[PDB]
Amino acid sequence: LNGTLMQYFEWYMPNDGQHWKRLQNDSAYLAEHGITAVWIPPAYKGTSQADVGYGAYDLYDLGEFHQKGTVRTKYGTKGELQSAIKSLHSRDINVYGDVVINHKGGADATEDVTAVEVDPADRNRVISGEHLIKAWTHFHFPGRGSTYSDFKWHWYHFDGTDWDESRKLNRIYKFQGKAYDYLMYADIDYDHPDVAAEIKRWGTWYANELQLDGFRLDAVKHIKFSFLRDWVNHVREKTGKEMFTVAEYWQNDLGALENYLNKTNFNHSVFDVPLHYQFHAASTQGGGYDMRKLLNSTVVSKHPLKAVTFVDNHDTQPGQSLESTVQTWFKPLAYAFILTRESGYPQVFYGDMYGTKGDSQREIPALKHKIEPILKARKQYAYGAQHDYFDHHDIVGWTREGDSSVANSGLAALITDGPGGAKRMYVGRQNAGETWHDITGNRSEPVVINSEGWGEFHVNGGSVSIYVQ
């Protein structure tokens, strides 16, 4: 009954075109362990076959046309993708597609365009007069043609770019006269009527072509909010489906996140970036972190229904752009936090489950065996009223009284970044007389609940204990 999301990709996975098949083959397992939704990587053609998917060359080429020297994307062909989705739906698992719409990369040709240079500090402070540059702005899709869409991109559909091809220069350009490869990407202009109309149309095309159930919105911090709000309303309306949507607004600031939510009318969720940073901070301070701090400054604490909680993702993993990996020892504690507490729509990271494949000497190992018990705790026991016990600097915990709707439901969780200990927690008089055991197997001793519903729970240092049944 509890929903659980899974980011089904890692940055360093092999470019062998078998990913869609792996996903398909992984459906039973996912269902076994309570995964109710899967967020797949960008399925459209990038700047090269090896593109992780954020280059975003052609949104209408889901690994179907020979473009950028390949038919398939890094993950597979459109057909394999469609088969994987079919098997996922047969198992009652929803699929959320990634949406990369703040820029387009890998233009087919440059265009002579008039531009002005702006201040790197204040990107709306002109520090140059108008002048001609050659910008990678012409997209015509030679391999696709007009199939699915005859819309062609030109410089006027964009706000600017960071590369002048004529002078081979890197500066911040803003196009004038309108009605390290990433430096050549062009920033999409949502003030242009044709652009806003086209992205909304592709949006519903995308949802229908793959039978998607929702979306993951990429890099929303720089996209016009009103547009994002309307794009979401639009796809839901044209489609007639719920279309759960979560946006990646990367800002470790509850303030900025709430504003984003208010400006977008609360029509979609946001990743709990602040929570991740606390997880990282705690895993980094060797027991010096005040564990009672986890309950504040996060999105779940304020907008539980609008938060997608996560431990790490493809941006924070070792070697990436926003690297701030939660240390392995702390990882299972963070997972217990997001998977067994009532608030938030938790997300499990593929890289944490099966390990990351970068070449740092600090890659994430496959934690599947440590996480599986917590997924089971969420799937079968995390129900009913919750009681919080964040009364200590090191050891904190919470209980779930369970729900009659779900048999033997109920749990007592305990996590500590410092030394081990015990804590008496109210578990529900309804559970009185029961003998509970640590599902993570970290503690061997049983705990029998008293007649008043209380229990003395224990936990090892720098560890996690989740007592059930």
Curated annotation (Swiss-Prot):
Similarity comment: Belongs to the glycosyl hydrolase 13 family.
Give residues annotated as binding Ca(2+) 2. Answer: 159, 179, 189, 191
Effect the entry attributes to changing residue 273 to Y = Increase in activity. Decrease in activity
Q: Per its UniProt record, what CDD domains does this chain match?
A: AmyAc_bac_fung_AmyA (cd11318)
Q: What is this protein called?
A: Alpha-amylase
Identify the species of origin: Bacillus licheniformis
Gene3D superfamilies recorded for this chain? 2.40.30.140, Glycosidases, Golgi alpha-mannosidase II
Write out the residues that bind Ca(2+) 3. 287, 289, 393-394, 417
What gene name does this entry carry? Answer: amyS
**Effect annotated for changing residue 170 to R:** Great increase in thermostability
Source taxonomy lineage?
Answer: Bacteria, Bacillati, Bacillota, Bacilli, Bacillales
Note on cofactor: Binds 3 Ca(2+) ions per subunit. Binds 1 sodium ion per subunit.
